[PDB]
């Protein structure tokens, strides 16, 4: 199927306490593989996946230099935005960045991403054509015009179509035993009485990868969308994910309810019942 | 665009000079470079909005600064013979990695041990050969600038009070009159080829102008010889039928 | 540690020829590579800027490639013109040490001379007179190279192209002068290999 590579960046200014904290992480699909934290002793880009450790020291020096330069660029970006928005130098402000590429099963570029946010809302983003910018306000239009004169999009387009795709397929091959091995969810249904005629049916999905999955409850074949409680997909802590869905059913009508699990690691969607 | 002052400079050893640069309007970062014969174009220092941003293999006797109006100065102190080079100034919008730098015209610096060997040029115009007039349809005038040191010269042709560039060729660099002697004088030549009818018209006025860059009245002169200041020496000729 | 090398040092070619200018750099972590031209008198003018992730850029008759992993770049100049005569400088923007302070590193350059094709060669040696002497070797073809003198008392310049563009005419020319009492234009260019059809006016 399709695959993706992503780099996330967060800069949080702490005025009066030193330089802003800079945390950046790299993801291939839903797998973390690189990280960098400015608050470390001597900060360097560090591996977080086994298939990325085989890269030489020239790889890790380059990724560390780029991480440090991104941190400095965000520092002076945060100072610049204080002038654009006429804000005080005493408050804390957040700068978020994300870029990366999506490829299909053939290994070709599906779409390129690069977008920035300031204080939780969109700031400026690279359009799908990898040539024009979308600015969220007149402050970001200042940045847009400078980036257009500096041809920033031309470097981003060349990277997203070139190095981003070439190195993504390299990561996917070196870690094919984990990045491409589907991990179907282990599923079951629990039952908890609430009163003398109301009970809960919870449908579990545990230890699956990737995180994309669908959990639906059906009564007599009818979809119970509005009557279903659904929790956010959560990480188990071992690169797998968990999720469950619950519905309140009348005591005695439990077998009329079916759970439907749709995951890419499953050959066919599962249909589960209470089954005491 | 980017401008620099002065254009030329002749100085002695141990002295100090200041070079000035005004970047493009709207540019916030200025750069300084040195182009020497042995090291080529070498980066010196960069300022961004009055703040130092990057530094090359600049010597401690070199000092630079960017002012609030974004123009910049560069002090070169304790001058040595090896400081003789072209000092370029550049500027860019800011701190982008995807745009270029815009360079000024440059400041040629020449450092001598003593200024007693500075000489202005002697200029002479040679009239065309009538054998060339009969054989071809043209008439070539030749200009010679001889006996100047150093080789800070700019030769131009003026026909009827107007500087001309068509039909003009000038040697790219001067040649040394005595290559065996170390502190030798230089010589430069230039040609202006016109129509034979244009030269045979006796009202046309041809003038060869050599802009010589030398000392300044700020310097000290002792010998009875005339102080070789930055001057213009000309030689002229009129048409002959 | 970052250093740039260019080959060839110089290049003298006939006009209209496709040119190949090479550039190498030792450090692959570059923000961009650029090709400048420097004309004597004016500063530098950026011709091409290849972004970090780009592999080629194009501007008119110019076309340059980039290979970061190999540390190589080639500038291609198609249909070269006399106006392209200049020094062509290769440059890379990169950080030198562990700092975001990027610097531009330049190569030594490639001095390019594009010689025009002389339409009607009429090589000859003429003598000029001063207004109160000079020999002129002119109108020779672009194949004749003007050698220097044998005596240090005789001064001989190199070739030099002038364009009387009012009639679209170009002519090569070289000047010889001396105050030697035994100096005639018939022997002023002895050391140079001249065409046999050189007109010597008597």
């Amino acid at each position: 199927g399709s695959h993706s590579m992503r780099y996330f960046h967060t800069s949080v200014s702490r005025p009066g306490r030193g330089e802003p904290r800079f945390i950046t992480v790299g993801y291939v699909d839903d797998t973390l593989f690189v990280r960098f934290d400015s608050d470390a002793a001597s900060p360097r880009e560090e591996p977080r996946a086994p298939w990325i450790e085989q890269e030489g020291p020239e790889y890790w020096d380059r990724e560390t230099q780029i991480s440090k330069a991104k941190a400095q660029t965000d520092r002076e970006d945060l100072r610049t935005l204080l002038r654009y928005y006429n804000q005080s130098e005493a408050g804390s402000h957040t700068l978020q960045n994300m870029y990366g590429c999506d490829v299909g099963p053939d290994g070709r570029l599906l779409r390129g991403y690069h977008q920035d946010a300031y204080d939780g809302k969109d700031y400026i983003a690279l359009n799908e054509d990898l040539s024009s910018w979308t600015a969220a306000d007149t402050a970001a239009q200042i940045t847009q015009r400078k980036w257009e004169a500096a041809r920033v999009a031309e470097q981003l387009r060349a990277y997203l179509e070139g190095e981003c795709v070439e190195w993504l397929r390299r990561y996917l091959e070196n870690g094919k035993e984990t990045l491409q091995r589907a991990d179907p969810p282990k599923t079951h249904v629990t039952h908890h009485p609430i009163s003398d005629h109301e009970a809960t049916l919870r449908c579990w999905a545990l230890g699956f990868y990737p995180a994309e999955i669908t959990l639906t409850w059906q009564r007599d074949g009818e979809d119970q969308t509005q009557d279903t409680e659904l929790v956010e997909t959560r990480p188990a802590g071992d690169r797998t994910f968990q999720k469950w869905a619950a519905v309140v059913v009348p005591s005695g009508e439990e077998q009329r309810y079916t759970c439907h699990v749709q995951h890419e690691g499953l050959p066919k969607p599962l249909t589960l019942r209470w089954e005491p | 665009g980017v401008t620099q002052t002065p254009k030329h400079l002749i100085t002695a050893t141990g002295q100090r000079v200041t070079l000035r640069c005004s970047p493009r309007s709207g540019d916030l970062s200025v750069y300084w470079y040195q182009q020497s014969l042995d090291q080529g174009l070498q980066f010196l220092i960069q300022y961004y909005n009055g703040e130092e941003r990057a530094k090359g293999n600049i010597l401690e006797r070199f000092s630079a600064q960017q002012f609030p109006d974004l123009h910049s100065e560069l002090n070169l102190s304790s001058l040595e013979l090896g400081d003789s080079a072209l000092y370029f100034c550049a500027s860019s919008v800011g701190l982008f990695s995807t745009d270029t730098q815009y360079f000024g015209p440059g400041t040629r610096l020449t450092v001598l041990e003593d200024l007693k060997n500075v000489f202005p040029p002697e200029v002479a115009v040679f009239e065309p050969s009538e054998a060339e007039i009969s054989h071809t349809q043209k008439a070539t005038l030749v200009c010679l600038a001889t006996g100047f040191y150093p080789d800070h010269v700019e030769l131009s042709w003026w026909v009827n009070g107007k500087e001309v560039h068509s039909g003009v060729c000038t040697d790219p660099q001067p040649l040394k009159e005595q290559p065996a002697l170390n502190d030798s004088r230089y010589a430069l030549s230039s040609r202006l080829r016109v129509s034979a009818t244009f030269w045979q018209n006796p009202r046309n006025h041809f003038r060869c102008q050599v802009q010589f860059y030398g000392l300044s009245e700020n310097d000290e002169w002792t010998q009875d010889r005339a102080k070789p200041v930055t001057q213009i020496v000309s030689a002229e000729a009129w048409g002959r039928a | 540690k970052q250093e740039v090398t260019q080959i060839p040092a110089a290049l003298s070619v006939p006009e209209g020829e496709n040119l190949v200018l090479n550039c190498s750099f030792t450090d692959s972590a570059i923000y961009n590579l650029q090709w400048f031209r420097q004309d004597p008198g004016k500063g530098l003018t950026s011709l091409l800027l290849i972004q970090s992730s780009q592999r080629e850029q194009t501007s008119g008759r110019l076309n340059a490639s980039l290979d970061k992993s190999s540390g190589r770049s080639t500038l291609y100049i198609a249909a070269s013109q006399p106006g392209d005569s200049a020094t062509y400088l290769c440059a890379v923007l990169s950080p030198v040490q562990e700092t975001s302070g990027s610097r531009l590193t330049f190569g030594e350059g490639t001095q390019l001379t594009v010689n025009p094709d002389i339409q009607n060669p009429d090589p000859a040696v003429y003598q000029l007179r001063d207004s109160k002497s000079v020999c002129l070797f002119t109108d020779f073809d672009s194949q004749t190279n003007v050698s220097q003198s044998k005596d240090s008392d005789v001064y001989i310049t190199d070739k030099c192209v002038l364009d009387m563009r009012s009639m679209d005419f170009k002519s090569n020319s070289a000047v010889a002068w001396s105050n030697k009492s035994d100096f005639a234009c018939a022997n002023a260019f002895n050391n140079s290999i001249i065409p046999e059809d050189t007109f010597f006016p008597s």
């Binding site: 654009y84 981003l156 190195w167 | 982008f96 | -």
Partner: peptide, 9 residues
Amino acid sequence: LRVMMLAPF
């Protein structure tokens, strides 16, 4: 592999 770019706001 990260991109190597300096694009100040």
